[PDB]
Design a protein around this ligand. Structure first.
Ligand code: 4D0
Ligand code: IMP
Ligand code: PLP
Length: 806
């Protein structure tokens, strides 16, 4: 037992054992003779859940009495992962439960592995929402996460013959002990219909109704007895030949069935539009109800709505609809209230990712909202015209309505017009927003534009996943850093401490052994634990340049084959991540990685000097295992393409060094740690711009770099696919003729930088000292810092570290 995991007092252990047995009997209806590990998991989950309930009821009661300003975080994604360990950590129950289960003859770590991830997100954006909920609870904010309860989250990834296969993620099959259904608070949502203009304003009539039923999940703050709520809506048909009519209820209920996995490319799918309106319409009724339970002038003083990307952008015209059509406020007053209530966070600059909904879809599904959007647009463009008289092209560029073959609504433009604050997610990204894609808006309303650099929760991403590191840190500086990560700066005093150097290195070794064991047990593959663990885990995208990593791997293989008896630093290269189902190039990249592995891992001349592993089914629970085990974090996106990144921050906190471009939050990470303690390579944003101006010619690099030429020839000729020699011709073609992300342009600098990594790894003491310098300066990247900045600079509320009574 370790100190950061809390006390195992005799009274507590006795009480936990008793309640475990009670739940096994009364809740699960099992006896100890036929109980499985799954039953034991559920008995523990219910036992821990019981400790949340008093705190949850009294937190919500406290908000009702004190009536603080409420923060509503609207997201289509909440990538929560597992709940059991996080709850124990935040309630200081971990050691007590470990003791209670041990005394019952059970291994708690084995029970933890049974829990399904709540995979209600795709990647960074979804996981950010999850870290944010944890920080908002920890900082005592009256905050509510609102989303959709998907029946199926992000698909499970299987690799079959080197190819991605998708399997439905039936995460609710065994039940969800954490949620509470609230069928009594079911609300109607309207679709289709038509608008009637009466003498008494507009009326939206002849609609189809879908019911929104809420399920509430507790969100505990770190040891402060605050328990906030995540409310997720589920779609239900209303109760009003016969057989078919009952069967057709599925059509309504399909709204909450499945998370869209296409994080690369916007497609105008009606079902996704319905999901976006569903969450917005149900949430806003809940917001207004809560506000009316103690004149809309005070609405922005009592309510903040944060839009996570443009996905809940319909909140803007929905709030207008409610205020104008139902509450009878004049347009100007309603608009003032709306702007002061709403704020918008942008997460990407790639044009193909922006939501641009066809007008014809909105006209049919949401005819009143389309009318409101047109009126917003006309009044907004009137302001632009008065500020920039005669600038007709600006009017076209800034319009919410896009002209063309199909007319579209630009949802980002809608969000900027209707929000008092617009933020990017890292300093470089927020600057790019002002200088490029939203330049016109910045010139009109400079005061709207902000930066809020992303962060991660140090509860899940240090204490939970890396208790060994948390403990050795706590031994020297105490426990206060867990909720005040800036205190890690105190560790700079230990950079020459021989004991600390040894302890940091020991913790990493243990994490690596544990992960190496996990790979053999669960996936039947053997790795050398003394090799450098070189890790790139993230969704598969061309911009993230898993392909550049692949080129380096093949370079190393070719160098070994050329000089087999020369010493090289042994590496285990691990790449993992899911590809969007319809993204052909991303699926080809996965196949390339496994194909390289097939050749490299079976070459007797290589031995255990180089191994290439594709990490199947990358998800939050796997990140918690692999990140503490990593030596080298690959953060290699083309400069200007990754808005922030957050995986980068997880690796920094956990004792990996970073090889990266000056992109997204990497810039600020290098600034914090010092450029000498970071492996920076490649084009800066300015260099990318210069290449675009003269034109990117991949052929030039192929002609001048013989090692690069060899790799392309190998790919083309069928070296990595002997039975299908032309398998990778799409990859070669893209690289040579149509590469938006300039893979070849960074190749030479990348390979050279990787040599410097290997050089440092040969000197374990200096490697570990650089690691200490990274861990010690990771404090800025706590989501507590991020949320404090949102609270003070956008929401107009003060964070609190003070305990509620237990
Ligand atoms: O996952 C997503 C988008 C997912 C998504 C999923 C589905 C649809 C969709 C829209 C319309 C029709 C059908 C589907 C759009 C987007 N984005 C994301 O993760 N962005 C990352 O946000 C992180 C948090 O700010 C940043 O650190 C990363 O830089 C950014 O790439
Ligand atoms: O009319 C009331 N009388 C007493 N307590 C209330 C009343 N309405 C709401 N509350 C409290 O505040 C609620 C929090 O849930 P909400 O209605 O979603 O904000 C409940 O859990 C109650 O504890
Ligand atoms: C942190 C995290 C991400 C985001 O990683 P990036 O490298 O920033 O894209 C994606 N998926 C999972 C499961 C994560 O935990």
């Amino acid at each position: 037992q370790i100190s950061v995991r809390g006390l195992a007092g005799v009274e507590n252990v006795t009480e936990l054992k008793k309640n475990f047995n009670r739940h096994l009997h009364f809740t699960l209806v099992k006896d100890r003779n036929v109980a499985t590990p799954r039953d034991y998991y559920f008995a523990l989950a219910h036992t821990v859940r019981d400790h949340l309930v008093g705190r949850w009821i009294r937190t919500q009661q406290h908000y009702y009495e004190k009536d603080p300003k409420r923060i509503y975080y609207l997201s289509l994604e909440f990538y929560m992962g597992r709940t059991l360990q996080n709850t124990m950590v935040n309630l200081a129950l971990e050691n007590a439960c470990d003791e209670a289960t041990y005394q019952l003859g059970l291994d708690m770590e084995e029970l933890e592995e049974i829990e399904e991830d709540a995979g209600l997100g795709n990647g960074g954006l979804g996981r950010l929402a999850a870290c944010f909920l944890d920080s908002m609870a920890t900082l005592g904010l009256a905050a509510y996460g609102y989303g959709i309860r998907y029946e199926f989250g992000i698909f499970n990834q299987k690799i079959c013959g080197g190819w991605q296969m998708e399997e439905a993620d039936d995460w609710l099959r065994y039940g969800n002990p954490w949620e509470k259904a609230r069928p009594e608070f079911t609300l109607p949502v309207h679709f289709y219909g038509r608008v009637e203009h009466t003498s008494q304003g507009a009326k939206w009539v002849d609609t189809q109704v879908v019911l929104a039923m809420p399920y509430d999940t507790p969100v505990p703050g770190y040891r402060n007895n605050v328990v906030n709520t995540m409310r997720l809506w589920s779609a239900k048909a209303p109760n009003d030949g016969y057989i078919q009519a009952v069967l057709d209820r599925n059509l309504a209920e399909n709204i909450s069935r499945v998370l869209y996995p296409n994080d690369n490319f916007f497609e105008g799918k009606e079902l996704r539009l319905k999901q976006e309106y569903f969450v917005v319409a149900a949430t806003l009724q809940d917001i207004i109800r809560r506000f009316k339970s103690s004149n809309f002038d005070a609405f922005p003083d009592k309510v903040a709505i944060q839009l996570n990307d443009t996905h809940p952008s319909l909140a803007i015209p929905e709030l207008m609809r409610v205020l104008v059509d139902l509450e009878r406020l004049d347009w100007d007053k309603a608009w003032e209230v709306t702007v002061k209530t709403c704020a918008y966070t942008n997460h990407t600059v790639l044009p193909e990712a922006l939501e641009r909904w066809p007008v014809h879809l909105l006209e049919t599904l949401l005819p009143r909202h389309l009318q409101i959007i047109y009126e917003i647009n006309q009044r907004f463009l009137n302001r632009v015209a008065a500020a920039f008289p005669g600038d007709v092209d600006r009017l076209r560029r800034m319009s919410l309505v896009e002209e063309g073959a199909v007319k579209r609504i630009n949802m980002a433009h809608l969000c900027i017009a209707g929000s008092h604050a617009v933020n990017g997610v890292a300093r470089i990204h927020s600057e790019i927003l002002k200088k490029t894609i939203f330049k016109d808006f910045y010139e009109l309303e400079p005061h709207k534009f902000q930066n809020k650099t992303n962060g991660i929760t140090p509860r899940r991403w240090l204490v939970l996943c890396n208790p060994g590191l948390a403990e050795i840190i706590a031994e020297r500086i105490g426990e206060e850093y867990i909720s005040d990560l800036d205190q890690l700066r105190k560790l700079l005093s230990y950079v020459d401490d021989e004991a600390f150097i040894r302890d940091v290195a020991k913790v990493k070794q243990e994490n690596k052994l544990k992960f190496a064991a996990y790979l053999e047990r669960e996936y039947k593959v053997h790795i050398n634990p003394n090799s450098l663990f070189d890790v790139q885990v993230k969704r598969i995208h061309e911009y993230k340049r898993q392909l550049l990593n692949c080129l380096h791997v093949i370079t190393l293989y070719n160098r070994i084959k050329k000089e087999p008896n020369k010493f090289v630093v042994p590496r285990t290269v691990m790449i993992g991540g899911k590809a969007a189902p319809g993204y052909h190039m991303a699926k080809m990249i996965i196949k390339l990685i496994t194909a390289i592995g097939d050749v490299v891992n079976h070459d007797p001349v290589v031995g255990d000097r180089l191994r290439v592993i594709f990490l199947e089914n990358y998800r939050v629970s796997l990140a918690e295992k692999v990140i503490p085990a990593a030596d080298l974090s690959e953060q290699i996106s083309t400069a200007g393409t990754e808005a922030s990144g957050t995986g980068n921050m997880k690796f920094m906190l956990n004792g990996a060094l970073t090889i990266g471009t000056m992109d997204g939050a990497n810039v600020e990470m290098a600034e914090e740690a010092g450029e000498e303690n970071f492996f920076i390579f490649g084009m800066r944003v300015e260099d990318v711009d210069r290449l675009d101006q003269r034109g990117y010619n991949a052929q030039e690099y192929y002609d001048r770099i013989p090692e690069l030429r060899q790799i392309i020839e190998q790919l083309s000729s069928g070296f990595f696919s002997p039975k299908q020699p032309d398998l990778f011709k799409d990859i070669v073609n893209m690289l040579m003729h149509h590469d938006r992300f300039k893979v070849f342009a960074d190749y030479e600098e990348y390979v050279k930088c990787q040599e410097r990594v290997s050089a440092l790894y040969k000197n374990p003491r200096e490697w570990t000292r650089m690691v200490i310098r990274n861990i010690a300066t990771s404090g800025k990247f706590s989501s507590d810092r991020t949320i404090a900045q949102y609270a003070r600079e956008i929401w107009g509320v003060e964070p609190s570290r003070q305990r509620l009574p237990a």
